[PDB]
């Protein structure tokens, strides 16, 4: 009864930076060839969505943000072969086209069809499926999940187990998989190692889960908000340190605690200074540091290249290094088999209509993940 | 006739920065416990020695520089078990104590006993074995090979094949092993990959040798001195580019040439700008860039961390990642088995007395390696 027709529904439109989202009616076009229209069931509030509001992450406005979500296929465009109406699905903010040099590479996952490097805020075809007040509205990372319905390209959606609890597995669309993969796939944390994790939010707690699954002997959580320490320990941190408690720079503290530097460090905040601090705190000859946090737009860090010449490895990754369409269904299957837990990340639940209150909870420091239900 | 006695011999003393080496008599004390006195046979002129003259690399002056060399043991102090008088040896500018956390780690080689990070210019015991005109003279990287005789700690010397040609294998003490290992051990260049090598001197040509040995399909040499291109192609470069020939930044040129970025890049110059350029020219999702060049003292580079967040890996290494005492004898054995060539790196052979002429050849761009013979 809606296939092939424009759908009028509610979405959270961001009309300008540093303002609340506007919950209002939008018009969602039917899917074109190789596109999929999805009825959203749950969406998470991720810090990267807040980065759009703050101007930290630049993407064209006005926009429908949201990228961590799960829903049910309402209709498919011509030529779609990988999902059907009624399937449970997770939108993929990093696509997997399967045909570019990155998708064919055994390690790479940052598909060249992504809308992150040079953001257009459109579908793959350069157009938008959203209208509000008669005005076209931009998409976000090819997902735009802050809406009762969205349209995504086929390369940006994965079919998942039909029995999946969508109000939990939406975290596999961003925060969990990013942190977990950063530890187990990107850093490749080894058994018995010492790890330092900077930032104990949704993504940082998932890094800790990955370090524990990898068998690390020590996992040092670092955060300036000591209220984050209790949950960090519950999911595997062996100790937590607040840089504000020390008279010395925390890289010096961490080097002393690890008797010469840590095996693996992770920056899971998004600050230039903590990116350099995290690199510095890993052991100078064989340490590995992984950047996960999103830096402020167009800003350069400053560092001494002798930190690398001694032997350190520095790398970063999107989405924990996972090839998105291959990995999301397998991660859901592992969740269904109890191989990892998502409940520790979910601190608050709200209806979609209270999205602004959910962003208030994130900004105040009180929440890890708020899940919004449509 | 010299064991247990002070030796008066010829050495090249650097009394202050930005001056020629002073060829004059020095006194070399006999070795203390766990020390080895070596009669030098051949020593190479490496850019890192010139960095001491220029102030690029800070180490205490006055100094006997030189670190790439081979010689014959004249005497050993009490407790030495790994070399004997008469053995052919290569001094190790990176020690291998075998007891520190780095030496025990399967991948680390920057032994904590090194004199690089916080240069003292002494023996391990904090004193010097050199006197000139009655004044104590500093050591350099625990080696100090610009002298007819030197004294090194046991952890900074490796015994090599008694049939080795010392006027060639001295290059295993620095330039060859650094470049070769940077490709085959640090970067782990893969078969069929595309590589870019910035800087076509002794170390850069050895990187090329390693990339070819690893089966790279394309090896792009980059140098502002087009006179370096012929030898680079002889040792494996498939193409060479001079950044001064282009109106665009070379990172953009290399990205176009490689249809989206190279698999492996190497900075083998020692400039902050080319370190960032080399990182940028590797493929954004899976490329690897290795810093080999020594940066000017105390200077920071500036870079956008999004270059790493997309998926790039950035690392550096000392001495090609090789555990020094384990690796040097094995590399000599490989050379004797004809597994690699050193003659392509040697452009000039001069008597030690012509050390300053040898540095003039390096500074003018004319030489790759000048070998000085004692
Ligand atoms: N690379 C990728 O694919 C992804 C990147 N991100 C980015 O990772 C970062 C973390 O995301 P979330 O965990 O969702 O955000 P979050 O805001 O919940 O967690 C950040 C934590 O860092 C702490 N913090 C802030 N400043 C600090 C400082 N100077 N020192 C120590 N701790 C500090 C905060 O107290 C907070 O607990 C964000 O920048 C996000 O945009 C998130 C998921 C995907
Ligand atoms: N990491 C380690 O263990 C070692 C580091 N090094 C360092 O590697 C670097 C190279 O050493 P060598 O090969 O012996 O020196 P080299 O001086 O013979 O080679 C440097 C090359 O870079 C070229 N070059 C200079 N500026 C350039 C620019 N803007 N753009 C492109 N090319 C440029 C020069 O024309 C020259 O051919 C030095 O900084 C050296 O101190 C050397 C061996 C050990
Ligand atoms: O949070 C999800 N995606 C992020 C990934 C890093 C760049 C900004 C967008
Ligand atoms: O060239 C030999 N050794 C170099 C190693 C990198 C720092 C300066 C000295
Ligand atoms: Zn792709
Ligand atoms: Zn996210
Ligand atoms: Zn050691
Ligand atoms: Zn050298």
Swiss-Prot record, chains A, B:
Q: Which parts of the sequence bind NAD(+)?
A: 48, 199-204, 223, 228, 292-294, 319, 369
Q: What is this protein called?
A: Alcohol dehydrogenase E chain
Cofactor comment in the record? Binds 2 Zn(2+) ions per subunit.
Q: Which residues bind an alcohol?
A: 48, 67
Recorded hits in InterPro entries, A to Z, give: ADH-like_C, ADH-like_N, ADH_Zn_CS, GroES-like_sf, NAD(P)-bd_dom_sf, PKS_ER
State the UniProt keywords alphabetically: Acetylation, Cytoplasm, Metal-binding, NAD, Oxidoreductase, Zinc
**Localization (cell):** Cytoplasm
Q: Mostly located where?
A: cytoplasm
Q: Which GO terms describe its cellular component?
A: cytosol
Pfam families xrefs? ADH_N, ADH_zinc_N
Cofactor(s) recorded in Swiss-Prot or TrEMBL: Zn(2+)
Cite the SMART domains for this sequence: PKS_ER
State the species of origin.
Answer: Equus caballus
Q: How does it assemble?
A: Dimer of identical or non-identical chains of two types (E and S) coded by 2 separate genes at different loci.
User: Which catalysed reactions does the entry list for this protein?
Assistant: a primary alcohol + NAD(+) = an aldehyde + NADH + H(+); a secondary alcohol + NAD(+) = a ketone + NADH + H(+)
Q: Which domain of life is it from?
A: Eukaryota
Q: Which residues bind Zn(2+) 1?
A: 46, 48, 67, 174
